[PDB]
RNA sequence: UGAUUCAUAAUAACUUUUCGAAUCGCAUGGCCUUGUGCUGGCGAUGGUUCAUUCAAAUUUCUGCCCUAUCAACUUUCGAUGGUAGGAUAGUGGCCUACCAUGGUUUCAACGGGUAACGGGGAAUAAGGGUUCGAUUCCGGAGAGGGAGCCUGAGAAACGGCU
RNA sequence: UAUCUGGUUGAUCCUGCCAGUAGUCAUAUGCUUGUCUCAAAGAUUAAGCCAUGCAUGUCUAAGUAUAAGCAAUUUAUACAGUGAAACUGCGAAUGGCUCAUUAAAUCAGUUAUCGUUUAUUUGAUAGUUCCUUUACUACAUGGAUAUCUGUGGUAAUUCUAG
């Protein structure tokens, strides 16, 4: 209506915040950034509801101002900066380096990553075009645009970005039997190998993907992110490791593991 | 008799805010209510913090005396506590002073009045004075 | 009378409702880019005028009390370096930190000095900033060039590889 | 604008009012387990009713297959915890027929009386109301509490207040004062 | 790329030649051709098309409550299509010119009614249902009515204007 | 959590309805009303009319500050501490409200923009402005306008003429 909408109501807020239904009218609208509103995570939600390093919004703001937070090398001061999938949040006091990675259920898991790994960022490939002055450039689904990529870096590949410099360390070619991580819908957060690629002219390229448990599932190509070669992922994944157990199994795990 | 059995559950050390934040859990056996100052003192004794940089809020006792479950922080310094903690908390503690101000409605009215006038008010005053004869 | 101002170039000796945007006289627009229809009095002199504004340009005989006897000096003074220079009659070589009407005011017992906040100069800091900017412009460009060169080299290598792959059947 | 706080008009009236036999039965039940109203009975029925419905639903799918297996099992476990279900009966089709009487019997109403303490149901209820009885060491004053069986052995008189024996309690104090005066 | 007159790069010109940092806070380094010389840090804002994000208009398919005591309607005054222009941020009868006679319809067009804003949902509750949805979320409309426009990235805004 | 009863009859079994019965984040109202948590609440009639007040403005180490302000003292012989006012910026197109229109319209999911604009966003990035090439604007180009201070009009208005 009449131009860009500026608020986000707390029910309309995306579920993988894991916000309270109650406790205020609104939720933080993640501002214009390198990630899509619903597939993002603002710095309020991270430092208040997940980590609980700030008891409230004001506290979070204060922390931001203090400038111990750094989402992907640069500093940030905006409460509602959309830090999305693969973004590396480093709090310099604590030295609690994090990478924003999904849990098997779907929500963003707080992955307490080491200092040596929290340095690069793995990122997908959205486009490969040439800009002005005839220079080829790659675009990432995770924000950045990098000039001059190795000619054999094509669409839907993944790219290890040095992050500090904002360059290209290395890449993985998207292909059959190469470790992949899922970022869309019912399979969001799982991890698998890649078996097929149903081509389909226009209407969404599907991908048959099996996990470590030999459990198959299918997703669209845009909802899949190439994380390594089977056995060696390029990033440390959280406990569970994109398996996603059955409900019964989960229950069993819960009520077997009673260690007071 | 009672001994004010204090605990400090869920201790999160906060280098960002420069504090140790935690759930205060506390017991009364036969006493009823703990009191805030007392709690603060206890915390100080425990943590070597001093009341000045201890800061507590929340609580609401369980039901049938016995227990109380509030929220307490212990800043890395007094200065730090002062420059982070909200003002209300400070006031409650005694550290800071109560900020003497006008009513909200009154303030709003004043603002409106200001908006209605233009430039400096001195000129307006002068004009009024001049009119006084007319 | 009644109180609508005599706007210039309107003509008639009459009261006329007129649409007025920002840029003209006769409307202080309270929204940045707002037209509004205010009444305005024509530019011609008739009977209903309580007042005609008159610039007493060239002098005569009788100086009246304090209209042409006393002189109210200028409240403000040249703010830019260039402006100051113009005011004075100096040129660039005279150098800078003075030609300014510093004040001496008292609270009561204490009596101390005011000065301006004068603008535009060959400021050392400014110069430094400029230099830095220039360096950035240079250096960045150089880096870009280097990158381009590298890319070209890579491309060449790739081409060579392709050629090698080809020469077989 | 926060969100609608949800509720349920949980506890539901019967479809006829004056089925005489039914009424009599209800009255009898009340007498047995000292209730203030038929309301409580209705609530109990609703609670049980829901469970029954769930069981039926589960049955309507194949036991062996997943939801039925799991959800049903969970329900059974819950029932066992509550202490309405026995340990002999954990087969879902046993839940199907639990009965309201059983449910009533599990209340902190009766689990005071059943364990002695009070003497005469109503008395127990009164005691519960008047800030005695702590299931843990936290004073329950709801009659319709439903005791956890796992925490039925832990039902004591309150740490504070009389009967537990911390303070004698008001009338006693008055009497003492009178004696002193004398 | 499924697919282009695509990306994009050259040749040719025009252009009432856009842009191309006479910008603000800290800090005050490096070579002496010993001038005050030439040089160089941390940042702010602007500014170009390409990204992205927030969005934006449209747009594909399928789905609405009652009525035949509405069977024809649309097409002089755009109806349907074409060609060309004009306009628009752009598609397009959006508008103009010229031509063709189409287009929809008992698989209810068109008209009339709604004490109809749409949906999520609500009440009831064996199964199938029936009724309600002004109203906490998502959309859409409106700011007494109807019109018109300024500013602006975005309004046909009404705590803007005419 | 599949349930029916009274009523034509002289009595009987049906058609059949009436009547009861149960529910309603479904309204109203009549009595009554001690407590705990929770809480809708001028939609239904009049998208009827509105006194008064308030509901959008806003400056940082970092846009401009000789308030003839504050405050003052151990950077100003162009400036440097705070800062009313005003011009520049950005914001006021969000939010809130309401449901009048509106029935293939809106809306729901579903596509598409190879059919477009997109301040903001984060990523990016411009040696070619010269115009014959033996004496030419750079270590900083110009004049305005507001605050103010002054000369005012008006019965008045968030009025503004010199
Ligand atoms: Mg496509
Ligand atoms: Mg300057
Ligand atoms: Mg007591
Ligand atoms: Mg082209
Ligand atoms: Mg056309
Ligand atoms: Mg409806
Ligand atoms: Mg209506
Ligand atoms: Mg609705
Ligand atoms: Mg209505
Ligand atoms: Mg709405
Ligand atoms: Mg009205
Ligand atoms: Mg309007
Ligand atoms: Mg209004
Ligand atoms: Mg508005
Ligand atoms: Mg039925
Ligand atoms: Mg008959
Ligand atoms: Mg009879
Ligand atoms: Mg009836
Ligand atoms: Mg009304
Ligand atoms: Mg303003
Ligand atoms: Mg709105």
UniProtKB/TrEMBL annotation, chain A:
Biological processes, Gene Ontology terms: cytoplasmic translation
Subunit structure: Component of the small ribosomal subunit (SSU). Mature yeast ribosomes consist of a small (40S) and a large (60S) subunit. The 40S small subunit contains 1 molecule of ribosomal RNA (18S rRNA) and 33 different proteins (encoded by 57 genes). The large 60S subunit contains 3 rRNA molecules (25S, 5.8S and 5S rRNA) and 46 different proteins (encoded by 81 genes).
Classification via InterPro entries: KOW, Rib_uL2_dom2, Ribosomal_eS4, Ribosomal_eS4_C, Ribosomal_eS4_central_region, Ribosomal_eS4_central_sf, Ribosomal_eS4_KOW, Ribosomal_eS4_N
Organismal lineage: Eukaryota, Fungi, Dikarya, Ascomycota, Saccharomycotina
Keywords (A to Z) from UniProt: Ribonucleoprotein, Ribosomal protein, RNA-binding, rRNA-binding
Coiled coil: none
Record's protein name: 40S ribosomal protein S4
GO terms for cellular component: cytosolic small ribosomal subunit
Pfam families: 40S_S4_C, KOW, Ribosomal_S4e, RS4NT, S4
PANTHER family documented for this protein: 30S/40S RIBOSOMAL PROTEIN S4, SMALL RIBOSOMAL SUBUNIT PROTEIN ES4
SMART domains: S4
PROSITE patterns: RIBOSOMAL_S4E, S4
From TrEMBL, chain B:
Biased composition (Basic residues): 104-116, 124-134
GO cellular component, one term: ribonucleoprotein complex
Database matches in InterPro entries: eRP_eS24_sf, Ribosomal_eS24, Ribosomal_eS24_CS, Ribosomal_uL23/eL15/eS24_sf
SUPFAM superfamilies: Ribosomal proteins S24e, L23 and L15e
Span list, region Disordered: 101-134
Keywords (A to Z) from UniProt: Ribonucleoprotein, Ribosomal protein
Gene Ontology BP annotations: translation
MF annotations from Gene Ontology: structural constituent of ribosome
Residue ranges of the TM segments: none
Family: Belongs to the eukaryotic ribosomal protein eS24 family.
Protein name: 40S ribosomal protein S24
Taxonomic source organism: Kluyveromyces lactis (strain ATCC 8585 / CBS 2359 / DSM 70799 / NBRC 1267 / NRRL Y-1140 / WM37) (Yeast)
From TrEMBL, chain D:
Keywords: Ribonucleoprotein, Ribosomal protein, RNA-binding, rRNA-binding
The protein's role, per its UniProt record: Component of the ribosome, a large ribonucleoprotein complex responsible for the synthesis of proteins in the cell. The small ribosomal subunit (SSU) binds messenger RNAs (mRNAs) and translates the encoded message by selecting cognate aminoacyl-transfer RNA (tRNA) molecules. The large subunit (LSU) contains the ribosomal catalytic site termed the peptidyl transferase center (PTC), which catalyzes the formation of peptide bonds, thereby polymerizing the amino acids delivered by tRNAs into a polypeptide chain.
One GO CC annotation: cytosolic small ribosomal subunit
RNA-binding S4 domain: residues covered: 106-170
Quaternary organization: Component of the small ribosomal subunit (SSU). Mature yeast ribosomes consist of a small (40S) and a large (60S) subunit. The 40S small subunit contains 1 molecule of ribosomal RNA (18S rRNA) and 33 different proteins (encoded by 57 genes). The large 60S subunit contains 3 rRNA molecules (25S, 5.8S and 5S rRNA) and 46 different proteins (encoded by 81 genes). Interacts with snoRNA U3. uS11 interacts with MPP10. Component of the ribosomal small subunit (SSU) processome composed of at least 40 protein subunits and snoRNA U3.
Family per similarity comment: Belongs to the universal ribosomal protein uS4 family.
Protein name, as recorded: RP21
NCBIfam families linked to this entry: PRK04051.1, uS4_arch
Molecular functions per Gene Ontology: rRNA binding; structural constituent of ribosome
GO biological process, one term: translation
Domain Small ribosomal subunit protein uS4 N-terminal: 5-105
Superkingdom classification of source: Eukaryota
Alphabetical list of Pfam families matching this protein: Ribosomal_S4, S4
Annotated organism of origin: Kluyveromyces lactis (strain ATCC 8585 / CBS 2359 / DSM 70799 / NBRC 1267 / NRRL Y-1140 / WM37)
Annotated spans, Disordered: 164-182
